């Protein structure tokens, strides 16, 4: 019965989360501020039927915990899912590591006692979360020494998530039973005791070229603290991560008990292990930019097609700012930004429509631009070959696919490239 639209008025884009995107919104009457997360029907499918979804999201809307994100209301029409939320302006946890000179084992300890704080609340609630990973630890304020707070706890028992822009920085953090199939509360200490490993070392436990090599070692489920980082850790640490990381889940430790660990209760800097998740934090984000960049070329180019189709078919005289404006309507808030659109642009359809969208790949373009030049940390202003192919590797590109598509940009290139031919390695590997 309850609308959203009649309640919320969208703002801004705060950005991309599991199922659907996060917008900015805000409450028309109050004037609330809102995270909401939008899931397209069509998009997403439902793992269990509608009964089971509303009494989790009626029981999601009671619980209340510091380091739990609080979900305000729910809404559905024939299309979408509205989950209405509290916004927490500090970021992703990593992004904030990354920025910091000093990484200390207490306060490795500090992030892992408020995420561990967070899950036991939910278990004894019966909340699993089967997808924790270090995107889903958002931080309540701008400060380093800020509140965690765990983002959609109980939503994946309800939606199904396979699209390579999605399901990037997954595999890390997965438990071996979810692969299998039979998997309880324990997955979430064990995606617990991965991040615990990345902040104490900068390095996931279990690593690979690509998606499935990476689950490939989750699923044997040996790891090593031999590596020269361990070196500076203490033994309490790794005998916390030893039972978090332990392979048959009635034997692994239960969140409840990792909070009584004598390292939480009991607790010098760990630089390379900065060292270490600046560039895996780098890697992530740049595969990520690079997915997001082919996903919006080729959407432009569907986009650009379909309006000029309805804008054609709206031209009688053989242009108009009202007929400008209902051509976007039919492809679909959306007259506001078509109002902004026209009178920016200004400042024929046909010439309008190359510069409303190359407006549109600019934005694309400078997105993945600050990407590669936050990936390029010593600022040579190119990435090797090896770089390459880890990034592509995390994105899923096969390697004879990118190399080919290399030397059809730049025929005498020497293991590097500038992010001018990045940009064009990209585009030809989306048929532009
Ligand atoms: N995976 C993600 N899902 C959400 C989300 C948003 C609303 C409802 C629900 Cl159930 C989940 C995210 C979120 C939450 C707050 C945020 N606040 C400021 C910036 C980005 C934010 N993103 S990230």
Known sequence: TAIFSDRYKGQR???????????????????????????????????????????????????????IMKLYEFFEDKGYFYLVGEVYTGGELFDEIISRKRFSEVDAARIIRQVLSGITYMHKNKIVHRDLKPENLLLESKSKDANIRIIDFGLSTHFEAKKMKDKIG???????????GTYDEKCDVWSTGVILYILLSGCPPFNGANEYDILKKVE?????????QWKKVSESAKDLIRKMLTYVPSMRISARDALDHEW?????????????????????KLAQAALLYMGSKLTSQDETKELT???????????????????????????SAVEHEVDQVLDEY????????????????????????????????KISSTELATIFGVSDVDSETWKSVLSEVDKNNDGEVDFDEFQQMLLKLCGN
Do not use: W
């Open 264 to 284: 939480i209760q009991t607790y010098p800097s760990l630089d390379n292990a900065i060292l270490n998740i600046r560039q895996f934090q780098g890697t992530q």
């Open 220 to 228: 044997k489920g040996k790891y090593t603290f031999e590596l020269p």
């Open 309 to 335: 189709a309805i804008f054609h078919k709206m031209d009688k005289n053989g242009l108009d700012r009202a007929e400008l404006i209902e051509g976007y309507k039919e492809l679909m808030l959306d007259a």
């Open 13 to 67: 884009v705060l950005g991309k989360g599991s199922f659907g995107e996060v917008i900015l919104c805000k409450d028309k009457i109050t004037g609330q501020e809102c995270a909401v997360k939008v899931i397209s029907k069509r998009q997403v499918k439902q793992k269990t039927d509608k009964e089971s979804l509303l009494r989790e999201v009626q029981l999601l809307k009671q619980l209340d915990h510091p380091n």
């Open 170 to 180: 997954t595999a890390y953090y997965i438990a071996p039973e979810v692969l299998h």
């Open 350 to 381: 046909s010439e309008f429509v190359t510069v409303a969208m190359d407006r549109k790949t600019l934005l694309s373009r400078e997105r993945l631009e600050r990407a590669f030049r936050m990936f390029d940390s010593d600022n040579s202003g």
